[PDB]
With several copies, the nearest count.
Chain A
């Protein structure tokens, strides 16, 4: 179906965009060490003596005291659990959609996919908030790169796919009532 096809395409775009954003290094453009195009895991160099040198970011820098609420924000940041958890849920959603074609009798695999995509979007919100909050706890100009917007764009795609999966679940359950009306 046309609605099914757009769901399949949307699922693969959201998964690809989210996967790329995790693996790329152009999340943020800020001044520091290595103009630097800081990423989610490793920061690198821009215009300067060094132009390709990358270094793994120290997410637990010693400069003081580590507040217990500040120690848990930097643990979630450092491990990027939510951006990674967004990729996993999108991957599960893709499998559920594919599994639906093989069976086409269950009807509860199309709902499961819808939950993952909606859940995947909610995880991406947390990852965006955690990433921004951690950066704001450091020092006078910055600008986000395309990698940051690829994750933001993936959230919009994922939510749109989630709506389609729910609508397909609703539509398939409407046909059964019509067949069971006679």
Chain B
């Protein structure tokens, strides 16, 4: 608009830099291509000089790592925090029956921790598993529609072992230890 304005507003000059030819000139400069018309006036050349400098800085930065952004397979997750489980209902989750990761839900007064328990009780078929590896394996076969809740150390062990199809999301919710 400015290039068209400066090159045509003056009645004492009556260039080919109309409104539509100005759009083409600016587009050609940014695309790193050539022009068919070039301004012949001081005001017009200032507009075309700062637009070439702007183009140079912007096209150099963009082309820096264009291939890297095109060849990156970023690791995306469905959920990050425990709060996500409460807010949805599609995926499921449970805990090791007769365990210390279960009693922590029943005896907690926190809103998030009380809500998740509610979802568990009325979850047919039951989500609790009598043995550890009966849950972690059911997760693998569930097509992603289950999230086990187990301690950090075990989840790190069952994360480096093949088939590495399981992983950890977010950080711990409580700090405790064995004895």
B11 touches A159 (CB 8 A): no
- Chain B residue nearest to A158 in the complex (CB): B1
Q: Mark A144-182, 1 if CB is under 8 A from B, else 0.
A: 000000000000000100110011011001100100000
Chain A interface helix/strand/loop/mixed: helix
A162 touches B14 (CB 8 A): no
- B8 interface contact, C-beta 8 A: yes
Q: Mark B1-15, 1 if CB is under 8 A from A, else 0.
A: 110110011010010
B5 touches A118 (CB 8 A): yes
- A64 interface contact, C-beta 8 A: yes
Q: A65-B144, A166-B9 are in contact. Are A118 and B1 (CB under 8 A)?
A: yes
Q: A167 to chain B: which residues have CB within 8 Å?
A: 19
Number of A-B contacts (CB under 8 A): 34
B1 touches A173 (CB 8 A): no
Q: Mark A88-122, 1 if CB is under 8 A from B, else 0.
A: 00000000000000000000000100110010011
Q: What's the least CB distance linking A104 to chain B, in Å?
A: 17
Q: A64-B143, A65-B144 are in contact. Are A111 and B1 (CB under 8 A)?
A: no
A170 touches B4 (CB 8 A): no
Q: A118-B1, A159-B1, A162-B1 are in contact. Are A170 and B19 (CB under 8 A)?
A: no
For the complex of A and B, 6 pairs with smallest distance between CB atoms: A173-B11, A159-B1, A166-B9, A166-B5, A163-B19, A162-B1
A162 touches B8 (CB 8 A): no
Q: Tell me the chain A residues, 37-74 only, with Cβ under 8 Å from chain B.
A: 62, 64-65
Q: A64 to chain B: which residues have CB within 8 Å?
A: 143-144
* B residues adjacent to A (C-beta < 8 A): 1-2, 4-5, 8-9, 11, 14, 19, 143-144
Q: A177 to chain B: which residues have CB within 8 Å?
A: 11, 14
- Chain B residue nearest to A62 in the complex (CB): B143
Q: B11 to chain A: which residues have CB within 8 Å?
A: 169-170, 173, 177
Q: What's the least CB distance linking B10 to chain A, in Å?
A: 9
A163 touches B1 (CB 8 A): yes
B14 touches A173 (CB 8 A): yes
Q: B2 to chain A: which residues have CB within 8 Å?
A: 118, 122
Q: What's the least CB distance linking A178 to chain B, in Å?
A: 11
Q: A111 to chain B: which residues have CB within 8 Å?
A: 9
